[PDB]
Amino acid sequence: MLACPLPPDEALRQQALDDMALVDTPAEHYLDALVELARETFGVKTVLISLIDHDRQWFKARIGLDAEQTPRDLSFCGHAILASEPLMVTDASRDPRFHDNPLVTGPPFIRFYAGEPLHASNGQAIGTLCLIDPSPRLLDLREGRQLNRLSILAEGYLQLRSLTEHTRFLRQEIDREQRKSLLDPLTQLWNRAGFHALHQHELELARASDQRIGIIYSDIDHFKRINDTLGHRAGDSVLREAASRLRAALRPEDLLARFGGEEFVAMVRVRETTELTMIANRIRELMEATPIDCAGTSVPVTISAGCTLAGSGEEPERALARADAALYDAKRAGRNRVVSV
Amino acid sequence: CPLPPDEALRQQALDDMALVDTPAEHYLDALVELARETFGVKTVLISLIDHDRQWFKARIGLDAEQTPRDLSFCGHAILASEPLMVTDASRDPRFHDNPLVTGPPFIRFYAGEPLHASNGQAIGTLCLIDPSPRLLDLREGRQLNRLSILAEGYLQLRSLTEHTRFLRQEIDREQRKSLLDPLTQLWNRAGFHALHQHELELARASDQRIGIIYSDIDHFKRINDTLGHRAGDSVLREAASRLRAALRPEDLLARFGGEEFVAMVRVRETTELTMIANRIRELMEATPIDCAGTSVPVTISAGCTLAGSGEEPERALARADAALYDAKRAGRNRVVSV
Known part of the structure; x- marks a missing residue:
């Protein structure tokens, strides 16, 4: 033994x-x-x-x-x-x-x-x-x-x-x-491929209970800076808490995944468009509610988000690119904000 | 408001x-x-x-x-x-x-x-x-x-x-x-009736056995008579709380009379069923139930059996009910399996 x-x-x-x-x-x-x-x-x-x-x-x-x-x-x-x-x-x-x-x-x-x-x-x-x-x-x-x-x-x-x-x-x-x-x-989220394996079943569950599928495309504001300025250890702490605050904004039935380096995509089941924006707003307020401790040093971190509802019969990839364009708008307009499209 | x-x-x-x-x-x-x-x-x-x-x-x-x-x-x-x-x-x-x-x-x-x-x-x-x-x-x-x-x-x-x-x-x-x-905040007989069928479907679809535990709080009459109705009510509420704590979220539990509870459970074979019946009895015997400050020792008798395939649900119920009565005669505070 x-x-x-x-x-x-x-x-x-x-x-x-x-x-x-x-x-x-x-x-x-x-x-x-x-x-x-x-x-x-x-x-x-x-x-x-x-x-x-x-x-x-x-x-x-x-x-x-x-x-x-x-x-x-x-x-x-x-x-x-x-x-x-x-x-x-x-x-x-x-x-x-x-x-x-x-x-x-x-x-x-x-x-x-x-x-x-x-x-x-x-x-x-x-x-x-x-x-x-x-x-x-x-x-x-x-x-x-x-x-x-x-x-x-x-x-x-x-x-x-x-x-x-x-x-x-x-x-x-x-x-x-x-x-x-x-x-x-x-971050202990599904990755890009994890999202890919699960997004379909998610659509299938929305259709069965007459729900819309909404996509939230988010990105941590100014990540490169904090990561280069403070350690890459501080970066990892920021990624760990951002992911945790994201999970707290969502519901258990949602799908959230880390996609690129500092970006996160949710696919939520909502009744209609204001519910989706509410969730996206919630994501942004939680991130902004407190600093993120990085080994004693507290670091203010904000997130920008673009969001959209996927059309009936619309290719998810298309809904995805739309949310991403909305996020690009959010960044351009000053960051720490959500654009709904 | x-x-x-x-x-x-x-x-x-x-x-x-x-x-x-x-x-x-x-x-x-x-x-x-x-x-x-x-x-x-x-x-x-x-x-x-x-x-x-x-x-x-x-x-x-x-x-x-x-x-x-x-x-x-x-x-x-x-x-x-x-x-x-x-x-x-x-x-x-x-x-x-x-x-x-x-x-x-x-x-x-x-x-x-x-x-x-x-x-x-x-x-x-x-x-x-x-x-x-x-x-x-x-x-x-x-x-x-x-x-x-x-x-x-x-x-x-x-x-x-x-x-x-x-x-x-x-x-x-x-x-x-x-x-x-x-x-007791449990299903009554009407609840159990409305839901038991759906529990046979789950057991079928997942190659599982159906088990019945038919249980009765011991010396209940004596308790009401000694300590009054409110202490009888205390014993019910709490006994139900323990019934729920010894079973699993997916099990069908119901009050079947003034002092009786019935559980329908999906399980592998007999051993597992008797195990669950004993987990309940233990859990009830593990501590005095508090009534108006005075603590009351409460114990539980129970019978159990598996429902053969296609067996009418009521037959299995009846058999576990018979087994509960064997448990009572053999000295209470115990589980008899059949």
Whole structure:
């Protein structure tokens, strides 16, 4: 048995996770909010929704951590899925399981870990919701409950998510292995090819419920500047938060993708044109509501957006170019604004 | 109560979620409990503004299933994009007249964040309510906000699920009023009847077995007789909450009598079914149910069986009901499988 031991029913466990079309999918607003809420609740530095996938720990949501994944053998969560009860570690530098672990030895010098297992509907433990911090800590029992509740909310959402048409499309038409081509792991959105694989099914769902398809074409204002002026690390932080604020402006049924370097395209299902502009406005207000922290330095960032509704029978590529022309208008007219066409 | 120009559309966006007059959901129940525990408040509601009433999809610390819309805080709250924060409803010009302020439960503190449909229409509210004046931190206000974001996300995702999509097609908002037991917030027998067929179709289409768990709270009569009706009611509400917490979002749960609950579940084979039946029994046995401060130990008997292929649903029901009675004779607090 490895440095992180496998449950005897590993095969079945990995299968409950595969049937959820979850590993290698984009961040979701709701889970982002949940980890943020957890962090704020307890005051810890890091919070993860970590999924145990073959020999890695892959993060569906995170906060206070830049890594997109970790080998299973380096994980705490990999031990936490081995039991029904929460894995509490008061001080990992003193714990036989983790005092050797490079994440305890080296950065981020994990001391406190509190991990609460997440399950598929069949009871199989697919991963964890966890708090992580560089100072020793022991949750009182009230905190234990809050954390427990927080973990029920995570599971809840994951399980419902597997009862949706997006998830059926994902497992039935997009091999868990193809899914890796389709995802920009920096912003945790679908990429250009990800959008391409999904845009059709999106139109199909709009037609079935008499909805319009609207396209929002956006672009971070003055990205080159911040990226050259401050580190390229600061750039990546700006890309990470912009993507997160974009996901918060959308609804769970929307399709959002990173397209070029600093540009993002949403395809939304709306009743009619004002709903679409509302969404685009919302995207722009969220981006502008606060600065974006870049390692202590707060950086004002705005976005421009062009948007349009796709006509009945219109080639999506055409609707797309129209939104892009509207975005070009938005930039020309002064940036930090939305043009609707 | 002041209502928006776009009341027609707001209402329509709510109606499209197939949401008013539906059963409590475990996840929403966990969420309001999280809220209650986080703020140390007496009452938390997920409140939906529906025509002339205010109906609760989830509630802790409050027994009414709905209240009238007019003079009610939430009909006022949706009207703005911002939280409605009332420090003391009794000294507030808008609300001191309100019967839930001057009569029970003597509301004073109120904090409500609007909840939205996909299109932005405000369909209701997540709110904290307490009989003592209070005013929130910006930190706390921001936590309430993230909780309201979660409730709103859940309700929008729920709207995209197979079952909810089915409810939008088949069972109109009019039919649903009579399919729901108000006290336990579960489907009643009429609900179960309206929905069980659709659950056979899912099981067929996905090569699955159908399982029935037929369960009965133990010594119920004794409880009412010892501690009165209100303590019987406490036991029901809470027992239903645990029924929902031990099953899974896609399972059909219903109240089948004064003290009986029935669950229909899709599963692989027998082992899995008995496992779920035992998860319920455990979960109910795991802690005393609180009644007016006095804690009451509540246990549960249950029978279960799989429905053979093509077996008439009623036959399987009858067999699990027989199995529940074996469990009772064998000493209660247990599951018998057949």
